[PDB]
Design a protein around this ligand. Structure first.
Ligand SMILES: Nc1ncnc2c1ncn2[C@@H]1O[C@H](COP(=O)(O)OP(=O)(O)OP(=O)(O)O)[C@@H](O)[C@H]1O
Ligand SMILES: N#CCc1c[nH]c2ccc(Cl)cc12
Length: 327
């Protein structure tokens, strides 16, 4: 069968911590008072929750309430444990409280409010300097959660909130996050289609923190090249073909050979034979202002089929792409 794999960093974090840290099933939730919060307006409804802007009437402060849809108690206690473990970490959304919603009879997570800049506005107006600045801020959040034995598994633009006026960034929506345990087989039905790592697309379950780095690479590529999304697959199979049209098929076959993976036979008549493309092929007069040799080198080191070969968040912070960023 497949060859096992482990992260090259933060491998032993969860074994050295007390079991209470990662055993989220055993965690006893400390319930707050639901009357402290007055719902103001529905912000959205996702697959697993309804999000509302609300006011904390005990301090007059704006909050965001996420009322979970009844799904599975295991998924709920896991998100709570991760948010509590990560609380106070750099650029990590702060969980302010946990209440029982009187209508849904389900938990409602209360978060600090971010006066966030519109997502299209961000996509359309962030400068070269702003992309480097904010990528550096995401890297602080990712290295923190990875050093804490947690993988996000849903890195994408909508999950990265920016209040551009205050140059404030927050990594949100920890509902797909999981504790990393070496040798554990994880569910590959994670991350949004355009941000899914090749490991997910080839059904390799023994993945790790490096999945977040691929997703970050997809975000970066879309920003610097002005192509939204960068890898535009019609479904999970065509998503891998879209990647192969850029990275090529030879390195893909080397990847599956290394891990003794068998590609789903549906790929035999759709994958084709593609050479790896040079990143300069995606440069044009409308994105030249966001591209540099340092940006292309950085991207190249994130977007690699072999998960073990990608830059870690801490190595990524050392990259020349960030030398211009004020620290
Ligand atoms: N802490 C927060 N502060 C301010 N707004 C938030 C906060 N958390 C979530 N939101 C906002 O809540 C609204 C609804 O979010 P939801 O979870 O439904 O994600 P989405 O943008 O709707 O979709 P997806 O994640 O699937 O792309 C979004 O506009 C999101 O920006
Ligand atoms: N794509 C896109 C837009 C965007 C949303 N959140 C972001 C965080 C960082 C950067 Cl560079 C860009 C974004």
């Amino acid at each position: 069968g497949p060859v096992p794999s482990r992260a090259r960093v933060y491998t032993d974090v969860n074994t050295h911590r007390p079991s209470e840290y990662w055993d989220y099933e055993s965690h006893v939730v400390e319930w707050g008072n639901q009357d402290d919060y007055q719902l103001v307006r529905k912000l959205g409804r996702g697959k697993y929750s309804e999000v509302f802007e609300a006011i904390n009437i005990t301090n007059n402060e704006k909050v965001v309430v996420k009322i979970l849809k009844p799904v599975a108690a295991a998924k709920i206690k896991r998100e709570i444990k991760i948010l509590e473990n990560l609380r106070g970490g750099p650029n990590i959304i702060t969980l302010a409280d946990i209440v029982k919603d009187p209508v849904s009879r389900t938990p409602a997570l209360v978060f600090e409010h971010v006066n966030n800049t519109d997502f299209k506005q961000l996509y359309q107006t962030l400068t070269d300097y702003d992309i480097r600045f904010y990528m550096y801020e995401i890297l602080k959040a990712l290295d923190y959660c990875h050093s804490m034995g947690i993988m996000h598994r849903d890195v994408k633009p909508h999950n990265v909130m920016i209040d551009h006026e205050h140059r404030k960034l927050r990594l949100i929506d920890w509902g797909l996050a999981e504790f990393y345990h070496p040798g554990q087989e994880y569910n590959v039905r994670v991350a949004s289609r355009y941000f899914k790592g090749p490991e997910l697309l080839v059904d390799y379950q023994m993945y790790d923190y490096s999945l977040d780095m691929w997703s970050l690479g997809c975000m970066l590529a879309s920003m610097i090249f002005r192509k939204e999304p960068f890898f535009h697959g019609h479904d999970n199979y065509d998503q891998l073909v879209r990647i192969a049209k850029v990275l090529g098929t030879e390195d893909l076959y080397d990847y599956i050979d290394k891990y003794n993976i068998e590609l789903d036979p549906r790929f035999n008549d759709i994958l084709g034979r593609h050479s790896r493309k040079r990143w300069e092929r995606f440069v044009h007069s409308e994105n030249q202002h966001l591209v540099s040799p340092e940006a292309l080198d950085f991207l190249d080191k994130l977007l690699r089929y072999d998960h073990q070969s990608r830059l870690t968040a801490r190595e990524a912070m050392e990259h020349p792409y960030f030398y211009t960023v004020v620290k």
